[PDB]
Amino acid sequence: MLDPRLSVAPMVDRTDRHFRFLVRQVSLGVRLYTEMTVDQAVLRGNRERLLAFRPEEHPIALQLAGSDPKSLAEAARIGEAFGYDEINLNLGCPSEKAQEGGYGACLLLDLARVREILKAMGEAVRVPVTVKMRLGLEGKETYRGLAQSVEAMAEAGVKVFVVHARSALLALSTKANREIPPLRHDWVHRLKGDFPQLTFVTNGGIRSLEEALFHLKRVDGVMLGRAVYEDPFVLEEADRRVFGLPRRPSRLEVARRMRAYLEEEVLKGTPPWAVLRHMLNLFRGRPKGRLWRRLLSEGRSLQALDRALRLMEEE
RNA sequence: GCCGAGGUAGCUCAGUUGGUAGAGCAUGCGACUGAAAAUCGCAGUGUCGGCGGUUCGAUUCCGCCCCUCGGCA
Numbered sequence: 471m472l473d474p475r476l477s478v479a480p481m482v483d484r485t486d487r488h489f490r491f492l493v494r495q496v497s498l499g500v501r502l503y504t505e506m507t508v509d510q511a512v513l514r515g516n517r518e519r520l521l522a523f524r525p526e527e528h529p530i531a532l533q534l535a536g537s538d539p540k541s542l543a544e545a546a547r548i549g550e551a552f553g554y555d556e557i558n559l560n561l562g563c564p565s566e567k568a569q570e571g572g573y574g575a576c577l578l579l580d581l582a583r584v585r586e587i588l589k590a591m592g593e594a595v596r597v598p599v600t601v602k603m604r605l606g607l608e609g610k611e612t613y614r615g616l617a618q619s620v621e622a623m624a625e626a627g628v629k630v631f632v633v634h635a636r637s638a639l640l641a642l643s644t645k646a647n648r649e650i651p652p653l654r655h656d657w658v659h660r661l662k663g664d665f666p667q668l669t670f671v672t673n674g675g676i677r678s679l680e681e682a683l684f685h686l687k688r689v690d691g692v693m694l695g696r697a698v699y700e701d702p703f704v705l706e707e708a709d710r711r712v713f714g715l716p717r718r719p720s721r722l723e724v725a726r727r728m729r730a731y732l733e734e735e736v737l738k739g740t741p742p743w744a745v746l747r748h749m750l751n752l753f754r755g756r757p758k759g760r761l762w763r764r765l766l767s768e769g770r771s772l773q774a775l776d777r778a779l780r781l782m783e784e785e
Numbered sequence: 786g787c788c789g790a791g792g793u794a795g796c797u798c799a800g801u802u803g804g805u806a807g808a809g810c811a812u813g814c815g816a817c818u819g820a821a822a823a824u825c826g827c828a829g830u831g832u833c834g835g836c837g838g839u840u841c842g843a844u845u846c847c848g849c850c851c852c853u854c855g856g857c858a
């Protein structure tokens with residue numbers, strides 16, 4: 471039993487184990503997702519570097535990308551061992567890299583392939599195998615086509631469908647595919663109405679917790695990506711209102727704990743910028759936030775963070 | 786001439802071991818205590834130096850070519 475009500479979207483070059491730990495200091499309940507991790511990188515690459523994460527990041531789900539059923543079943547078997555509570559399948563990445571590899575959003579073209587992929591992964595691991603998909607391809611999406619492909623996946627085992635509510639135009643850039651196609655959140659709402667036994671987590675364009683709450687009164691969950699990264703404290707009230715916990719974090723308290731987390735990591739071989747480049751938005755839209763962001767991007771050291779914290783305390 | 790170590794936004798630069806490329810300062814527009822300081826948001830644009838090599842595909846790895854650099858000659 472997992473809590474799908476709220477989560478931070480998987481974002482390449484964003485949601486590494488460092489930023490995930492940061493978000494965990496802001497919200498205890500919010501579900502975290504790893505970056506898209508290709509199956510071949512899990513099978514042949516340094517597995518400790520890729521998948522190893524901290525136990526504080528629980529709950530956390532490893533998202534895998536691929537096309538070969540046997541390769542994704544082996545990659546899901548490996549992810550489960552590292553302790554991931556969930557193995558999510560990437561069916562939305564419209565990059566040129568994805569199209570050439572035949573994985574991501576272009577996998578939606580072939581339900582027969584996607585269904586044998588899901589059957590293999592689900593039987594290879596005991597953790598819930600989910601999916602993060604898009605509404606369709608080349609703006610040719612129909613509601614009966616999306617509901618029909620969701621039916622097939624559900625018969626393959628899938629229970630949770632994290633839906634990025636917008637089509638993927640393979641011709642456009644990746645940054646263009648997250649701003650141009652129309653957001654049909656109402657399509658996901660109807661997916662819950664046609665499939666009340668399934669869990670749907672709508673996603674796309676959610677700017678605040680107030681908007682996320684609106685969508686929660688219609689579907690099971692909401693996923694925020696750029697809203698969280700651009701300013702982690704967009705989930706400031708997430709715990710208290712969504713997860714019903716009695717705790718509201720302070721931007722300064724979180725900075726104090728992120729400093730101690732930076733001391734452990736740096737002191738055991740972690741480059742200081744690997745942790746500091748994700749703390750720049752901690753004071754976004756706050757007094758003297760500029761100087762906080764300047765100090766860390768210039769110094770890039772524990773000592774620099776100590777002087778930046780001291781200033782924030784003075785202010 | 787042997788070599789250290791580099792070519793990424795205008796700028797000083799990150800990118801840790803092939804997989805949805807971006808930090809800072811500075812340009813530009815904007816919010817605000819009254820113009821105004823202080824303060825903050827918004828967006829920006831990439832042939833990741835050119836040529837082949839592997840690959841599903843490499844800013845990332847090979848060889849070649851190639852501009853500023855530093856000790857040795």
Ligand SMILES: Cc1cc2nc3c(=O)[nH]c(=O)nc-3n(C[C@H](O)[C@H](O)[C@H](O)COP(=O)(O)O)c2cc1C
Pocket residue numbers: 479480481482483484505506560562563602634648673674675676693694695696697805
């Ligand atoms: C920088 C960036 C990287 C992303 N990488 C992934 C990814 O690796 N896997 C994935 O399923 N979605 C990825 N996405 C898409 C997000 O998961 C999400 O669907 C999209 O940002 C829209 O949701 P949002 O408006 O709440 O951010 C990425 C988005 C961004 C902005």
